[PDB]
Amino acid sequence: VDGLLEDKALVEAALFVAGRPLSLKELSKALGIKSLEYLEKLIELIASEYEERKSAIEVVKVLGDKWVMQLKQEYSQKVIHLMPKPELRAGELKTLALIAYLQPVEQSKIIKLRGSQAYEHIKKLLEMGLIYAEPYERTKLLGTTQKFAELYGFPENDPELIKEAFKKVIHSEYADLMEKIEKNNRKDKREE
Amino acid sequence: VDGLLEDKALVEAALFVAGRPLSLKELSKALGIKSLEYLEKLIELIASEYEERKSAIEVVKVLGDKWVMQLKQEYSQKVIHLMPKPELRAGELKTLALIAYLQPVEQSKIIKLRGSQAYEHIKKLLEMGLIYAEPYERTKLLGTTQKFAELYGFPENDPELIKEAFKKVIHSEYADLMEKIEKNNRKDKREE
């Protein structure tokens, strides 16, 4: 069931999630298409179907054989004030997912699975008010705040539902750390 | 010429550029639609046209009367490795646009139009290798590097084309600073 409509639906999903220019030789590696002739045909298609759709989104080739899924000039100028302005880096966001899944987690455990790198991520996330640091037996316990819940779509702020939703995120996007979770769990089970 | 197909094309452009949940009462303010009955009808429409399209992108309502333009689960798991992982904050990116448009610009001038805030933005951007700091007459001259050009789609690295493309960005997204540019230009003209 590795059909053509699924090859094409995968192409447009990559152009949606990338937001940046990408070439056929670049998509060929990540998407896994062999014949660049076939991959290119899918993008002229996906571009025309948005063209005849008269939709605000458009797919055009830019610079050296690279394709994008931008917004048209005519509408981007209208929705300028809706662009997000993120404040967190890739490392801080990665440590936030670890805290949101292990919570309540001892601060020393995070820095074990992150290095002294996270010493400034935890300070930044407490500064942003997205995590708490409750003092516990000469160390700290980290978890997500109410502000984290509103920002991320949990009106409930159920700590068990958040530990679930970020178990997928850690598995999906941070697979190296996810086994670094597992490898340490096997260590603690053997150690004591 | 404020038609219906332009009301609808503006709705989908907001859902594209937001990436986050937004309610009808929220879109009503930014988009400028009055009747929430009419605005809501546009979104059930724009959702069905993607539904019958059998496209990887989907528009669903989540939580409390809020609408999103996500990727379907089935494809997001495939294109995980194409998500961007930005390293810059909103302030650093804002100072980068100012440097990319005023280049070559004296460092003291940036901090005038940014405060001591930019003292760490300039240090971070030099650290990232996106700007240079050439010493000039007891101060520094800031401008964008080659690495900035490849990242942002200028294979040419023509400093005049970059000063142009970021004159739009500063006008569009940083209108407060754009007149703070103008107000200081009027000051320098009067001062000397």
Short mmCIF file of all heavy atoms in Angstrom, two decimals, chain B residues 146-173:
data_model
loop_
_atom_site.label_atom_id
_atom_site.label_comp_id
_atom_site.label_asym_id
_atom_site.label_seq_id
_atom_site.Cartn_x
_atom_site.Cartn_y
_atom_site.Cartn_z
N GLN B 146 29.00 35.34 5.26
CA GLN B 146 28.64 34.40 4.21
C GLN B 146 27.64 33.38 4.71
O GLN B 146 26.69 33.02 4.00
CB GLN B 146 29.90 33.69 3.70
CG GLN B 146 29.84 33.21 2.26
CD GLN B 146 30.11 34.31 1.25
OE1 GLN B 146 29.25 35.14 0.98
NE2 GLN B 146 31.31 34.31 0.69
N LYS B 147 27.83 32.89 5.94
CA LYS B 147 26.93 31.90 6.51
C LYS B 147 25.51 32.44 6.61
O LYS B 147 24.54 31.69 6.42
CB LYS B 147 27.46 31.46 7.88
CG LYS B 147 26.62 30.43 8.60
CD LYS B 147 27.29 30.02 9.89
CE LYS B 147 26.40 29.12 10.73
NZ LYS B 147 26.55 29.40 12.18
N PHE B 148 25.37 33.73 6.91
CA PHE B 148 24.05 34.35 6.90
C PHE B 148 23.43 34.30 5.51
O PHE B 148 22.21 34.15 5.37
CB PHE B 148 24.15 35.80 7.39
CG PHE B 148 22.85 36.56 7.35
CD1 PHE B 148 22.02 36.60 8.46
CD2 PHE B 148 22.47 37.26 6.22
CE1 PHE B 148 20.83 37.30 8.43
CE2 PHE B 148 21.28 37.97 6.18
CZ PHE B 148 20.46 37.99 7.29
N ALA B 149 24.26 34.43 4.47
CA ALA B 149 23.73 34.47 3.11
C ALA B 149 23.20 33.12 2.67
O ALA B 149 22.12 33.04 2.07
CB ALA B 149 24.82 34.97 2.16
N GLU B 150 23.93 32.04 2.97
CA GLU B 150 23.46 30.71 2.62
C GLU B 150 22.21 30.34 3.40
O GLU B 150 21.29 29.72 2.86
CB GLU B 150 24.56 29.68 2.87
CG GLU B 150 25.95 30.11 2.42
CD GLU B 150 27.06 29.35 3.14
OE1 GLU B 150 26.75 28.34 3.80
OE2 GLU B 150 28.23 29.77 3.04
N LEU B 151 22.16 30.72 4.68
CA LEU B 151 21.00 30.40 5.51
C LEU B 151 19.74 31.10 5.03
O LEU B 151 18.64 30.56 5.17
CB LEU B 151 21.28 30.78 6.97
CG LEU B 151 21.94 29.76 7.90
CD1 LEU B 151 21.68 30.10 9.36
CD2 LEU B 151 21.47 28.35 7.60
N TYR B 152 19.89 32.30 4.45
CA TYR B 152 18.74 33.15 4.17
C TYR B 152 18.44 33.29 2.68
O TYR B 152 17.60 34.10 2.30
CB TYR B 152 18.95 34.53 4.81
CG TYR B 152 18.68 34.55 6.30
CD1 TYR B 152 19.50 33.87 7.18
CD2 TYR B 152 17.59 35.25 6.82
CE1 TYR B 152 19.26 33.88 8.55
CE2 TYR B 152 17.34 35.26 8.18
CZ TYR B 152 18.18 34.58 9.04
OH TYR B 152 17.93 34.59 10.39
N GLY B 153 19.11 32.51 1.83
CA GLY B 153 18.73 32.42 0.44
C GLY B 153 19.41 33.39 -0.50
O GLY B 153 18.92 33.59 -1.61
N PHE B 154 20.52 34.01 -0.09
CA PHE B 154 21.33 34.82 -0.99
C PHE B 154 22.62 34.06 -1.30
O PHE B 154 23.59 34.14 -0.53
CB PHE B 154 21.65 36.19 -0.39
CG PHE B 154 20.48 36.86 0.29
CD1 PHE B 154 20.19 36.61 1.63
CD2 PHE B 154 19.72 37.81 -0.38
CE1 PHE B 154 19.14 37.26 2.26
CE2 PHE B 154 18.67 38.46 0.25
CZ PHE B 154 18.38 38.18 1.57
N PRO B 155 22.68 33.28 -2.38
CA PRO B 155 23.99 32.79 -2.84
C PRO B 155 24.92 33.91 -3.27
O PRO B 155 26.13 33.71 -3.32
CB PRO B 155 23.63 31.88 -4.03
CG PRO B 155 22.18 31.54 -3.84
CD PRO B 155 21.57 32.71 -3.15
N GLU B 156 24.37 35.09 -3.58
CA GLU B 156 25.18 36.18 -4.11
C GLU B 156 25.98 36.87 -3.00
O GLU B 156 27.13 37.26 -3.22
CB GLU B 156 24.29 37.20 -4.82
CG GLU B 156 23.03 37.58 -4.04
CD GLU B 156 21.78 36.92 -4.58
OE1 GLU B 156 21.60 35.70 -4.35
OE2 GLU B 156 20.98 37.61 -5.24
N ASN B 157 25.38 37.03 -1.82
CA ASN B 157 25.94 37.84 -0.74
C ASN B 157 26.21 39.27 -1.19
O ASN B 157 27.26 39.85 -0.91
CB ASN B 157 27.21 37.20 -0.16
CG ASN B 157 27.58 37.76 1.21
OD1 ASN B 157 26.98 38.73 1.68
ND2 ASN B 157 28.57 37.16 1.85
N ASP B 158 25.25 39.84 -1.92
CA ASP B 158 25.33 41.25 -2.29
C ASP B 158 24.81 42.08 -1.12
O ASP B 158 23.62 41.99 -0.78
CB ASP B 158 24.52 41.52 -3.56
CG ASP B 158 24.86 42.85 -4.21
OD1 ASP B 158 25.12 43.83 -3.48
OD2 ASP B 158 24.88 42.92 -5.46
N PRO B 159 25.67 42.87 -0.47
CA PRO B 159 25.21 43.63 0.70
C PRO B 159 24.10 44.61 0.40
O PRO B 159 23.33 44.96 1.31
CB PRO B 159 26.49 44.34 1.18
CG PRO B 159 27.38 44.38 -0.02
CD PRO B 159 27.08 43.12 -0.79
N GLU B 160 23.98 45.08 -0.85
CA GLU B 160 22.91 46.01 -1.19
C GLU B 160 21.57 45.30 -1.36
O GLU B 160 20.53 45.87 -1.03
CB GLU B 160 23.27 46.78 -2.46
CG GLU B 160 24.54 47.61 -2.33
CD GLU B 160 24.47 48.60 -1.18
OE1 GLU B 160 23.47 49.36 -1.11
OE2 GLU B 160 25.40 48.62 -0.36
N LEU B 161 21.58 44.07 -1.87
CA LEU B 161 20.34 43.31 -1.98
C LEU B 161 19.83 42.88 -0.60
O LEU B 161 18.62 42.77 -0.40
CB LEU B 161 20.54 42.08 -2.87
CG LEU B 161 20.76 42.34 -4.36
CD1 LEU B 161 21.09 41.05 -5.09
CD2 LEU B 161 19.53 43.00 -4.97
N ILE B 162 20.74 42.64 0.35
CA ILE B 162 20.32 42.27 1.69
C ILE B 162 19.77 43.48 2.44
O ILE B 162 18.77 43.38 3.16
CB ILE B 162 21.49 41.61 2.45
CG1 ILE B 162 21.82 40.25 1.84
CG2 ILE B 162 21.17 41.47 3.93
CD1 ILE B 162 22.96 39.53 2.52
N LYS B 163 20.41 44.64 2.27
CA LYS B 163 19.88 45.86 2.87
C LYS B 163 18.50 46.19 2.34
O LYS B 163 17.70 46.83 3.04
CB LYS B 163 20.84 47.03 2.61
CG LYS B 163 22.13 46.97 3.43
CD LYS B 163 23.22 47.83 2.81
CE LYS B 163 22.90 49.31 2.93
NZ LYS B 163 22.79 49.73 4.35
N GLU B 164 18.19 45.76 1.12
CA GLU B 164 16.86 45.96 0.56
C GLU B 164 15.85 44.98 1.16
O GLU B 164 14.81 45.39 1.69
CB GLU B 164 16.90 45.80 -0.97
CG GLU B 164 16.32 46.96 -1.74
CD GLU B 164 16.15 46.64 -3.21
OE1 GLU B 164 16.75 45.64 -3.67
OE2 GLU B 164 15.40 47.36 -3.91
N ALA B 165 16.16 43.68 1.09
CA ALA B 165 15.20 42.66 1.52
C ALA B 165 14.85 42.79 2.99
O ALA B 165 13.75 42.41 3.41
CB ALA B 165 15.76 41.27 1.23
N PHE B 166 15.76 43.33 3.80
CA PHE B 166 15.49 43.55 5.21
C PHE B 166 14.97 44.95 5.51
O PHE B 166 14.63 45.24 6.66
CB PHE B 166 16.75 43.26 6.05
CG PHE B 166 16.91 41.81 6.40
CD1 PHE B 166 17.50 40.93 5.51
CD2 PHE B 166 16.45 41.33 7.62
CE1 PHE B 166 17.64 39.59 5.83
CE2 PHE B 166 16.59 39.99 7.94
CZ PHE B 166 17.19 39.12 7.05
N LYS B 167 14.89 45.82 4.50
CA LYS B 167 14.13 47.05 4.66
C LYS B 167 12.63 46.76 4.62
O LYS B 167 11.85 47.45 5.28
CB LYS B 167 14.50 48.06 3.57
CG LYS B 167 13.82 49.41 3.73
CD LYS B 167 14.46 50.47 2.85
CE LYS B 167 14.48 51.82 3.54
NZ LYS B 167 15.64 52.65 3.10
N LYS B 168 12.22 45.73 3.87
CA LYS B 168 10.84 45.28 3.92
C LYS B 168 10.53 44.60 5.25
O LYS B 168 9.49 44.86 5.86
CB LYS B 168 10.56 44.32 2.76
CG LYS B 168 10.94 44.85 1.38
CD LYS B 168 11.08 43.70 0.39
CE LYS B 168 12.17 43.97 -0.62
NZ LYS B 168 12.52 42.76 -1.41
N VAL B 169 11.43 43.72 5.70
CA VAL B 169 11.21 42.98 6.93
C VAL B 169 11.08 43.92 8.12
O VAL B 169 10.20 43.75 8.98
CB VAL B 169 12.34 41.95 7.15
CG1 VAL B 169 12.19 41.26 8.50
CG2 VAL B 169 12.36 40.94 6.02
N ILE B 170 11.94 44.94 8.19
CA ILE B 170 11.88 45.89 9.29
C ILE B 170 10.60 46.72 9.21
O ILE B 170 9.95 46.97 10.23
CB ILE B 170 13.14 46.77 9.31
CG1 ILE B 170 14.34 45.97 9.82
CG2 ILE B 170 12.92 48.01 10.17
CD1 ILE B 170 15.55 46.81 10.12
N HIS B 171 10.22 47.14 8.00
CA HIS B 171 8.97 47.88 7.84
C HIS B 171 7.77 47.01 8.17
O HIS B 171 6.84 47.44 8.87
CB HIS B 171 8.86 48.43 6.42
CG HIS B 171 7.84 49.51 6.26
ND1 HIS B 171 7.26 49.81 5.05
CD2 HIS B 171 7.30 50.35 7.17
CE1 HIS B 171 6.40 50.80 5.22
NE2 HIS B 171 6.40 51.15 6.49
N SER B 172 7.76 45.77 7.69
CA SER B 172 6.61 44.90 7.85
C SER B 172 6.44 44.47 9.31
O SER B 172 5.39 44.71 9.92
CB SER B 172 6.74 43.67 6.95
OG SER B 172 6.70 44.04 5.58
N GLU B 173 7.47 43.85 9.88
CA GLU B 173 7.34 43.18 11.17
C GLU B 173 7.83 44.00 12.35
O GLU B 173 7.50 43.66 13.50
CB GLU B 173 8.09 41.85 11.13
CG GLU B 173 7.59 40.90 10.06
CD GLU B 173 8.67 39.98 9.54
OE1 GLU B 173 9.50 39.51 10.35
OE2 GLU B 173 8.70 39.72 8.31
#
